[PDB]
Amino acid sequence: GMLESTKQFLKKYNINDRVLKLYETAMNDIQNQFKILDDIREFNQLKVLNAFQEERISEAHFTNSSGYGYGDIGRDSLDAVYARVFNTESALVRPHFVNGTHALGAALFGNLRPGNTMLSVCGEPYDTLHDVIGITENSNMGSLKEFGINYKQVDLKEDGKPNLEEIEKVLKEDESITLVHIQRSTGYGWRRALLIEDIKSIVDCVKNIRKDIICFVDNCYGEFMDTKEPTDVGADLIAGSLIKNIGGGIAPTGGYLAGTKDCIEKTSYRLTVPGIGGECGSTFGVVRSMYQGLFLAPHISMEALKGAILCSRIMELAGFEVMPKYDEKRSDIIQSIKFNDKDKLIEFCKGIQTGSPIDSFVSCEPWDMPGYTDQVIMAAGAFIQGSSIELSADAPIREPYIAYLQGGLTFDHAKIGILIALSRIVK
Amino acid sequence: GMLESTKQFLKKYNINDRVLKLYETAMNDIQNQFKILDDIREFNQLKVLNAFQEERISEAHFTNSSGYGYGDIGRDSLDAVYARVFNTESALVRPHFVNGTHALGAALFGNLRPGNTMLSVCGEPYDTLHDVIGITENSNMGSLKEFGINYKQVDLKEDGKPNLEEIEKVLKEDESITLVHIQRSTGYGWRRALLIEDIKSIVDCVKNIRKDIICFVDNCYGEFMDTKEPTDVGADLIAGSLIKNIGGGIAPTGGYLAGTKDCIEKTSYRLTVPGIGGECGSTFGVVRSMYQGLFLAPHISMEALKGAILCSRIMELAGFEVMPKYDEKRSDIIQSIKFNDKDKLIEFCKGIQTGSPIDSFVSCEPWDMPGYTDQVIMAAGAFIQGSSIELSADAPIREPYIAYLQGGLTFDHAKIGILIALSRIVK
Amino acid sequence: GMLESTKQFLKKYNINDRVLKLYETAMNDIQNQFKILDDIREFNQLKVLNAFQEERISEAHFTNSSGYGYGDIGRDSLDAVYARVFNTESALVRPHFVNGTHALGAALFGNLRPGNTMLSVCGEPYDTLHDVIGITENSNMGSLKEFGINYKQVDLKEDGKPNLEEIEKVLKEDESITLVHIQRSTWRRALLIEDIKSIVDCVKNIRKDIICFVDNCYGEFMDTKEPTDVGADLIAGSLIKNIGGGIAPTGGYLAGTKDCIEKTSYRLTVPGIGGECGSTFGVVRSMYQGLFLAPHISMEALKGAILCSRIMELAGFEVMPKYDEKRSDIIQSIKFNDKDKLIEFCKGIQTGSPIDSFVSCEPWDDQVIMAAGAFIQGSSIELSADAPIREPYIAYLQGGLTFDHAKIGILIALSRIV
Amino acid sequence: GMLESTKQFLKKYNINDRVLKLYETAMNDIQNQFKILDDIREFNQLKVLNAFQEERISEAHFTNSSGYGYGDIGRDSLDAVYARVFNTESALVRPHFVNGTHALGAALFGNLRPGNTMLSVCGEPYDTLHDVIGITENSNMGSLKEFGINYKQVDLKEDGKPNLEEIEKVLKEDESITLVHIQRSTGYGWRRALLIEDIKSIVDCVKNIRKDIICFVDNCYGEFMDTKEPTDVGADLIAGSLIKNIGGGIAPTGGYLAGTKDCIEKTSYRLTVPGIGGECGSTFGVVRSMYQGLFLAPHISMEALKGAILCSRIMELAGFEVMPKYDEKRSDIIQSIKFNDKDKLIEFCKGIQTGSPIDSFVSCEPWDMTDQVIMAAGAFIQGSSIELSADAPIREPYIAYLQGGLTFDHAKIGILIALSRIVK
């Protein structure tokens, strides 16, 4: 078990016996869940490895392109590797995407035209996607609604599963709907994340009514959570962020997209412009960090998930409501905790920040973040700015006072942050 | 005068006395015009220096942001410096623009909504912008025509200056026109250059009919060509590429935009997505090269211009029609050369290619463009791939075989390149 | 347990049930040894984390670094973070070291003046360090012998432990010896932390002014302690190994007393400047990030070496170190007693590599064959293998960014034997 | 001539009519000198352009190596390009060199062994090179003297030219002398520059007594200053800094060495260690800036030199003694100005700092490191001497040393801003 040197070192951070004993109890109760993740990870490592070996990757693929970047073998082979990993025709892996929202927004504006209608089957989508769609306060910024692209919505059932009966009615009753949006990660809510098994039901259901409907899945945080991905259950196009899971903590920035050749090309013309698409775009000498990041993604993703499981159990034992539980199948690295107390929520976040490698001394304060309606606090003591694959904790300041912990480059680091944070709220 | 050891060295490149004496006559005739560029350059150097100083630029501004890039002082202050240089409210300089076309498109999509008409007042815009507007094919890529944005056009008069009479009639007859497009650079045309004086006429004219119209100006190849810029004569928004003039030969990639805060913000929502705009976007640690590139821009631009002026005169004394002439006011760094022969055009390009630092050995033959009928021969060999500010040439194979030389980091390099090319035709 | 989909996927790499059944047994046997590594790793991750926090590392430390690099906060703080991790006074972490041999040699030339004798207490040192010292066959390159710095040697005892009796006789009978060279990495038992202390106390007792230098390659984060925690005056190592965590693109490091580190920097640079100049080339974040992942990534390679040791013993080969032995490095050796089995093994490791999988793996030019396919060129922290072709045909496997990757490459290689 | 807008803009920087009129005269006088620089630059651009072409450089040479970096074609072809530029057998151009001093130090430790003697024929060498050699102070840092390598010195004559008669006698009397150090740049001495013509005289002289002697020349600031380089007049080895002339204001860091294969190989073993040498070493993806910097070096070097010529003339007309003069043949881009007043020296440096693109707001003042010094530094590349900058130790007769200017226009904008704080 934990060495006596380690115990004594933790005392410097004021990690009391209550928290340390509470940690050891949690660590025992969650050991069986860990071995299920390792044999999943094993497949994913071989899945990525195979993708490299088929595309015939070499030292020559770590390009330092400049200008237009015509004939960039590193950039093109990286797209091909992603296509093989997600088992899709094409893929658009680029550092030019400022964040995950840009990648998601690119897919929508790329695959939607004036007259077409959109349909989010998992209720209100990620809060930063509202202005892109133009659901609420529609300013003259150039949203989907402002370009004649309509938006309908169907919420999930009370239990959390997708309301298939209602999805069929809406599609049948509105033939203009050409794209169906499927958010995988729960986001800032209180429900369990949709499994691959849950996505297959939504895809089979909508594809049965009309086969030409595009199934777009917001795949952030769900990378390598299961042996299969949404693209392996009929998903026409997915999208995500390189500073999260798939980047493995190495990827400096960017986003990715994987799907049918037509869906990816249409998305590339939004990223750039019609006629160019993905033809131009230098990699800024960071292509190797993206390759190596993908290779470590299956491993790093599970380290953060293990920290998420530990967090769930230790916090439950402490007496706080947790979502998801330690023994439930997880479709993402996010671990939400409901404190029902504002003091405890901020102290917990400040504790995660203080247990980080970068900007430890910096104190977390609710920040008026872009895209989010309410003022959201975040604990982002990371090498790469705002990475959620690295240990981090954020929460919108609103009742119920729910904190959202995720990440951990190594399980040991994630673990330490949890002990430091928990000690700061319970003496 | 040229040293005896220099012209002896030049003989190794098959440079003959006929071309060499023809050079000495041209070099003497353009001395007065070179003096005019020097004092214009003198102002632009001080105009750029002042921009840095007013923004208190420091080594702290050479950032190396990652992930989102919130608070990237380098990025933000570089935008501020561009705003000062071009005397505009705001600016949007990013390494994320794959090329100049991306920048120009970003402005169009960002400032045009369904129902709005567009109007090019300098005739047909350059080839790779047709797909963005949707003039030629419009094959479901997401062109302006496919988003309900119409395109209109008014050609230039016989003399080369804008047809202001027809511009008024077109604006008066169609109130839907909210944006007017102005291409400063000549491109593949045999006409007099469009000067700032001429641009002021276009703005004053269209702004007189209806002030709410946006006067967008394609500023490619025209940066620091005159003490004033289009933004100094009322232009609401301008756009260009960083691998041309303004990058000063150092800029690795990217593009820029400068204008009113409204146009820039609206353009940024196309670059990324509505709700984010330019609030995110890491600079990959290449912001220093963009600052230094700008600082060297006024100087490097005139090295290329001086090379074009020398090219114009020496080729005119050689018996070939040239456009523009050596002593005409210029809008861009391009120089056209009408050979009236396929072989003379081919030999000149091969000569330019053979006088380049990178890829001199490479075979320079004509090749077939993927979406055009006529073949194209091109002379390219730069540090930054496809940089136009570096010595380069291009020409479509068709009567009367007009070549387009452009760029040169140092006038000497342009001079050496021209002498190698002309000595290959004139024995 | 391995999913049905995984073993069906592995069939594509010719992996049979002989090897797969042999693996299950090998995996079950080494679980207790893996648990000992996990809690050793737990302390090291905390040790590195505390080093960053005490030094107040921030986003500002990853800023631009050009020219001379005077007052480079990113560089100086990285040295300070290393000094804390190794509990030393100062440190010299620079990306300018071409490799480990540069770092090790920089320490020797830095702390040796004409007349001084050197003493390797672990037999002949690393093969590439012979010309640096100028032991034999000297051309005018500027070796230690050519600058008037002498060299002596003392081999290890037959059992593997250091000969403390012979070390005393040599130091007592030769007062010119001012430095003791202690190579940590290892066909024999690896030199552990406790053994290193036994060598330091033995030499420091006779004459305290003697500087104990320890070549710490591959030994980073193998134990909760380091050579510097047991009285070592200075250590050196390559950043493309254990301590770089697979991310560090190049460089080397040094950690020890302020006098030894400053004296070493004047060789790296020149007397008068030393470490005062040297920009980080915009790759300092990877050196920090690499150090943070080092404790974790190092044990992935070690776990792969433990699996490699057990699975080959069960397969019918002589292995060294054995699966249940305390380790001083991530290296795992395998005696084959056959030329084809050795070649086929490396042939297979090359196939299991992410980079250059397709590339041919045959003996270069006695004679040697190598399996390399890493993101960083020649980084032994990533799955690699090398072996000289000569009886009993011993192989040397090292690395693996993740245990799953090491496991796969090791599994593919054995599948060619059976 | 200068436009009304330009001079109306300069008035915002407090530039008076006296200074501006003084500039017009100075600019008129130095016209012919600028033409002499333009026809030297022309040859240098062609010399470099050819080197790239002879080496068959391409987009594949902009490598991004890692780890050891074996087979790094970009690094090897860069050396070969430099070798062709300097007409030498071998070359060693690396970003690994912390600075020019480290390049020089590597050359000395690399070619000298215990028992050998070193000889500087240009007097006392560059101040920071003392600790490397171990001339005066010898703390146990590992100087040349501390590794049994001796040092001797022969000063220049009163006129500034090398004392050839003493050089001969000194070499004949001590056969242990195997290396002859030669500093090209004038440094901080108020004397005439050492030309390639004068460097040839030193080589021919020392080689006649004993051809075995290695002629080493510290080539800092002399790159592309003339059509011929020290290696073209018999120099066995040379060394310089990439953040000075030869990097064209683009090279981020590093240093170079050009000379015989035996010299360059021996030096690389000091840079690294014996056995490895230059065989290992990743270029950090900055090899493009080094190529590109070399290609702009011939042009950028003369932009700084022209600013120095302009400085020398306008300051002479302003009533201050200068060195070198505007019409003299130069060996470096450094221009010294005698003020005979503490305030006038300080105000001049403050104005240059004001005219910098970076750290313009940073008010420079006296600071100690023998006695106090004031420095004007504001560059993109930290401490780049090719960018406009100035330094001056605070003591009589108060001499300032101005260097650099990426473009001549920027150089003159800094000078006019500085001179306007001192005169009328």
mmCIF file of C-alpha atoms in Angstrom, chain A residues 1-3 5-6 9-10 12-13 23-24 35 38-43 45-47 49-53 56-59 62 227 248-250 252 288 291-292 295-296 299-300 303 353-361 382-384 390 409-413 415-417 420, chain C residues 1-3 5-6 9-10 13 23 35 38-43 45-47 49-50 52-53 56-60 62 224 245-247 249 285 288-290 292-293 296-297 300 350-359 374-376 382 401-405 407-409 412:
data_model
loop_
_atom_site.group_PDB
_atom_site.id
_atom_site.type_symbol
_atom_site.label_atom_id
_atom_site.label_comp_id
_atom_site.label_asym_id
_atom_site.label_seq_id
_atom_site.Cartn_x
_atom_site.Cartn_y
_atom_site.Cartn_z
ATOM 1 C CA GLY A 1 0.000 0.000 0.000
ATOM 2 C CA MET A 2 0.890 3.689 0.377
ATOM 3 C CA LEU A 3 4.412 4.116 1.823
ATOM 4 C CA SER A 5 7.113 8.412 3.419
ATOM 5 C CA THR A 6 4.095 9.267 1.247
ATOM 6 C CA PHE A 9 4.762 13.993 2.851
ATOM 7 C CA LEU A 10 0.962 14.486 2.497
ATOM 8 C CA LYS A 12 2.629 19.067 4.614
ATOM 9 C CA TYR A 13 -0.584 19.751 2.595
ATOM 10 C CA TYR A 23 -9.300 7.479 0.795
ATOM 11 C CA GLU A 24 -8.010 3.979 1.659
ATOM 12 C CA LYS A 35 -9.476 -4.027 -14.077
ATOM 13 C CA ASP A 38 -7.456 -1.877 -18.257
ATOM 14 C CA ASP A 39 -8.687 -4.600 -20.639
ATOM 15 C CA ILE A 40 -10.721 -1.866 -22.500
ATOM 16 C CA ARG A 41 -7.585 0.318 -22.654
ATOM 17 C CA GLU A 42 -5.581 -2.645 -23.950
ATOM 18 C CA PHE A 43 -7.807 -2.882 -27.050
ATOM 19 C CA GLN A 45 -3.900 0.956 -27.438
ATOM 20 C CA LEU A 46 -3.776 -1.830 -30.064
ATOM 21 C CA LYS A 47 -6.516 0.025 -32.009
ATOM 22 C CA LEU A 49 -1.119 1.228 -32.763
ATOM 23 C CA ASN A 50 -2.690 -0.551 -35.744
ATOM 24 C CA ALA A 51 -3.817 2.814 -37.202
ATOM 25 C CA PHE A 52 -0.189 4.095 -37.192
ATOM 26 C CA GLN A 53 1.230 0.879 -38.668
ATOM 27 C CA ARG A 56 3.060 3.594 -42.616
ATOM 28 C CA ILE A 57 4.033 6.463 -40.245
ATOM 29 C CA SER A 58 7.707 7.483 -40.009
ATOM 30 C CA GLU A 59 10.090 10.291 -38.924
ATOM 31 C CA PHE A 62 6.750 14.968 -38.266
ATOM 32 C CA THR A 227 -13.680 -0.247 -27.325
ATOM 33 C CA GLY A 248 -3.312 12.762 -24.391
ATOM 34 C CA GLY A 249 -2.151 15.979 -22.663
ATOM 35 C CA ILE A 250 0.530 16.545 -25.370
ATOM 36 C CA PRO A 252 -1.115 21.976 -27.623
ATOM 37 C CA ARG A 288 4.461 15.254 -33.709
ATOM 38 C CA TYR A 291 0.643 12.006 -33.255
ATOM 39 C CA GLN A 292 2.279 11.126 -29.955
ATOM 40 C CA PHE A 295 -0.854 7.267 -29.183
ATOM 41 C CA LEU A 296 -1.011 8.085 -25.435
ATOM 42 C CA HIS A 299 -3.731 5.421 -21.594
ATOM 43 C CA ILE A 300 -4.125 9.021 -20.350
ATOM 44 C CA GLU A 303 -5.922 7.643 -15.814
ATOM 45 C CA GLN A 353 -6.026 24.457 -8.162
ATOM 46 C CA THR A 354 -3.651 24.351 -5.159
ATOM 47 C CA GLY A 355 -2.980 20.626 -5.916
ATOM 48 C CA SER A 356 -1.816 21.359 -9.508
ATOM 49 C CA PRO A 357 1.676 21.568 -11.108
ATOM 50 C CA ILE A 358 1.141 24.958 -12.833
ATOM 51 C CA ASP A 359 -0.356 28.145 -11.269
ATOM 52 C CA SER A 360 -0.784 26.533 -7.810
ATOM 53 C CA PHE A 361 -0.357 29.852 -6.004
ATOM 54 C CA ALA A 382 -2.328 22.863 -16.583
ATOM 55 C CA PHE A 383 0.705 22.809 -18.915
ATOM 56 C CA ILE A 384 -1.595 23.410 -21.868
ATOM 57 C CA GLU A 390 -5.181 17.366 -17.132
ATOM 58 C CA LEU A 409 -2.372 12.985 -16.704
ATOM 59 C CA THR A 410 -1.465 10.254 -14.170
ATOM 60 C CA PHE A 411 -3.816 8.631 -11.625
ATOM 61 C CA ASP A 412 -1.341 9.521 -8.858
ATOM 62 C CA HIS A 413 -1.665 13.238 -9.679
ATOM 63 C CA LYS A 415 -5.528 11.255 -6.586
ATOM 64 C CA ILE A 416 -3.362 13.888 -4.831
ATOM 65 C CA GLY A 417 -5.603 16.733 -6.030
ATOM 66 C CA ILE A 420 -5.876 18.123 -1.113
ATOM 67 C CA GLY C 1 -9.035 -10.128 -18.500
ATOM 68 C CA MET C 2 -8.161 -9.712 -22.196
ATOM 69 C CA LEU C 3 -11.332 -9.179 -24.263
ATOM 70 C CA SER C 5 -12.118 -8.743 -29.490
ATOM 71 C CA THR C 6 -8.507 -7.997 -28.397
ATOM 72 C CA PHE C 9 -7.353 -8.416 -33.191
ATOM 73 C CA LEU C 10 -3.918 -9.746 -32.079
ATOM 74 C CA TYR C 13 -0.011 -10.002 -35.792
ATOM 75 C CA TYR C 23 1.200 -14.528 -21.140
ATOM 76 C CA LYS C 35 1.911 -3.340 -6.674
ATOM 77 C CA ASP C 38 2.730 1.493 -7.896
ATOM 78 C CA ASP C 39 3.365 2.832 -4.357
ATOM 79 C CA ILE C 40 7.025 3.730 -5.222
ATOM 80 C CA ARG C 41 5.566 5.653 -8.182
ATOM 81 C CA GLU C 42 2.988 7.264 -5.844
ATOM 82 C CA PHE C 43 5.754 8.941 -3.810
ATOM 83 C CA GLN C 45 4.699 11.679 -8.489
ATOM 84 C CA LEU C 46 4.156 13.586 -5.216
ATOM 85 C CA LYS C 47 7.883 14.417 -5.017
ATOM 86 C CA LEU C 49 4.516 17.791 -7.907
ATOM 87 C CA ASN C 50 5.913 19.420 -4.726
ATOM 88 C CA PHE C 52 6.886 22.436 -9.161
ATOM 89 C CA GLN C 53 4.689 24.055 -6.489
ATOM 90 C CA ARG C 56 5.841 28.520 -8.297
ATOM 91 C CA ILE C 57 5.853 27.286 -11.893
ATOM 92 C CA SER C 58 3.300 29.116 -14.075
ATOM 93 C CA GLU C 59 2.260 29.609 -17.705
ATOM 94 C CA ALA C 60 4.784 32.504 -17.746
ATOM 95 C CA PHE C 62 6.857 28.614 -20.978
ATOM 96 C CA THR C 224 11.891 6.642 -3.962
ATOM 97 C CA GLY C 245 8.782 10.928 -19.724
ATOM 98 C CA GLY C 246 8.797 10.290 -23.496
ATOM 99 C CA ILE C 247 8.064 13.998 -24.279
ATOM 100 C CA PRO C 249 12.839 16.028 -27.493
ATOM 101 C CA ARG C 285 7.385 23.145 -21.671
ATOM 102 C CA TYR C 288 8.742 20.337 -17.557
ATOM 103 C CA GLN C 289 5.841 18.190 -18.769
ATOM 104 C CA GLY C 290 8.254 15.293 -19.333
ATOM 105 C CA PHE C 292 6.004 15.493 -14.420
ATOM 106 C CA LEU C 293 5.094 12.353 -16.405
ATOM 107 C CA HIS C 296 4.565 7.369 -14.272
ATOM 108 C CA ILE C 297 6.073 6.690 -17.732
ATOM 109 C CA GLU C 300 5.323 1.629 -17.618
ATOM 110 C CA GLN C 350 10.314 -3.375 -34.752
ATOM 111 C CA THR C 351 6.909 -4.557 -36.101
ATOM 112 C CA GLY C 352 5.255 -3.590 -32.783
ATOM 113 C CA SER C 353 6.679 -0.036 -33.076
ATOM 114 C CA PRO C 354 4.341 2.888 -34.005
ATOM 115 C CA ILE C 355 6.993 4.590 -36.147
ATOM 116 C CA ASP C 356 8.943 2.701 -38.850
ATOM 117 C CA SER C 357 6.949 -0.559 -38.344
ATOM 118 C CA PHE C 358 7.405 -1.431 -42.023
ATOM 119 C CA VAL C 359 11.234 -0.774 -41.866
ATOM 120 C CA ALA C 374 10.070 6.140 -31.600
ATOM 121 C CA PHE C 375 8.594 9.663 -31.858
ATOM 122 C CA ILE C 376 11.857 11.085 -30.469
ATOM 123 C CA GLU C 382 10.065 4.325 -25.810
ATOM 124 C CA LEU C 401 5.436 4.753 -23.097
ATOM 125 C CA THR C 402 2.503 2.658 -21.879
ATOM 126 C CA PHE C 403 2.600 -0.884 -20.458
ATOM 127 C CA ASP C 404 -0.040 -1.890 -23.039
ATOM 128 C CA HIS C 405 2.337 -0.867 -25.862
ATOM 129 C CA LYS C 407 3.087 -5.700 -23.689
ATOM 130 C CA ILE C 408 1.984 -5.793 -27.370
ATOM 131 C CA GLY C 409 5.536 -5.467 -28.808
ATOM 132 C CA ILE C 412 4.407 -9.988 -31.042
#
